[PDB]
Amino acid sequence: AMGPQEYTLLKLKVLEPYPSKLSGLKGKNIFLVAATLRPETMFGQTNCWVRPDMKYIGFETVNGDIFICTQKAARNMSYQGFTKDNGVVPVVKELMGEEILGASLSAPLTSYKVIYVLPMLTIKEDKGTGVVTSVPSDSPDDIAALRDLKKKQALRAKYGIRDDMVLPFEPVPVIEIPGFGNLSAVTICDELKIQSQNDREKLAEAKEKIYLKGFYEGIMLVDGFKGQKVQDVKKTIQKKMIDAGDALIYME
């Protein structure tokens, strides 16, 4: 089987007003950084995910921009040209999930010109950058989570998150997949009747259906390429974000 795998690493730009732990980095370009295998779906981003317990790090890259992700992810990045010297992570700030919750972000492609950082209680430091992408139109973990917050008020107030940052945000139709249509993620977790993020094995069965069918049988709804096979299009969307300086190839 071997490794590593090719992922697309999006650059989500932390927008002024910065949160208070990043005050010392004002003036510098900061990006939260998240990986995905499905960049075609990235037109319908609603938010970010970050885990309150989990330790994050800000570190400076080859070109002075500074990324935020786990220190484990950074290390991996240092060994593939991301940093000025190989295997050298210049850490600029230690962090926590809480400490960047609610930060404003301009994420690429998405029609929402500004999206916010939201909490997710179970992110694993095993795979990934620790910052997770959110397209709930097509990813069943993401509606589960989004709904979950939209349901419970006290559970947002714990972390100090505004109605501004969650309620007005609707899944954006990106891909028409034959069986389930537009909000295909949404419409199966209804069929499967999922309540929480913590219905892990019901979610598993969701992902089973819609991930491959979406890729192989999906059809694109967004301007610039309507009626295009997800399959045929994905690579050319990846290259837009890279050529536009919005994403990088990340190997893991």
Add this chain to the structure above:
Amino acid sequence: AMGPQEYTLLKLKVLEPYPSKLSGLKGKNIFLVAATLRPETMFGQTNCWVRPDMKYIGFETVNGDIFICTQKAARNMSYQGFTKDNGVVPVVKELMGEEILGASLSAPLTSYKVIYVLPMLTIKEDKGTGVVTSVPSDSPDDIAALRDLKKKQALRAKYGIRDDMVLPFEPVPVIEIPGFGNLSAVTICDELKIQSQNDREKLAEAKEKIYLKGFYEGIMLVDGFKGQKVQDVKKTIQKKMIDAGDALIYME
């Protein structure tokens, strides 16, 4: 994170003399079928892996060729165009690991014009096709395994396997990676002092080092492209095998 991932599925052609469970399929084109993320290394194949307990299946594909892999893998394949009708796996033969152990194979690229199927005691039906690739020059699980047969002469005689099929098969240098050279897989499991296949967490730490370094810092030794970055070359080796009808894109 999302899914599915892009793998390269090699087609390993079962060569006459067929094993006895496949006698009824004589005349037809049969391929054992295995996935990988590192097709550049596939020039240095020594064998196959199959698991005696595990149930396999032969099933017929769109073009009448018949693949051998797990019924679980086949299902996944049927939903991405591999079979004449979507989600319909015409099973031609049920099978077992034992029942194809020792079969002769002509696998693509590799300099060994004929390689054989060998046993591996712990393959998981979780990921993959159940039939696993073997390049022990650059994959640390493969020398661990392969070595374990060579030394245990009696315990390879468990599933009736001729010296012919093992002792003459040497890891073929494919990639020069700076720290460890040619047989870079080999030379770290020496450093880490691994004895069996069942040193799983020592192997883990092996894989840690050489997989990414090999990809990002590797350099190609094979004819047609010596002195070429693994990185830059991989995709163009994938397309050879596909264009030459020897491998397919497999999503999982």
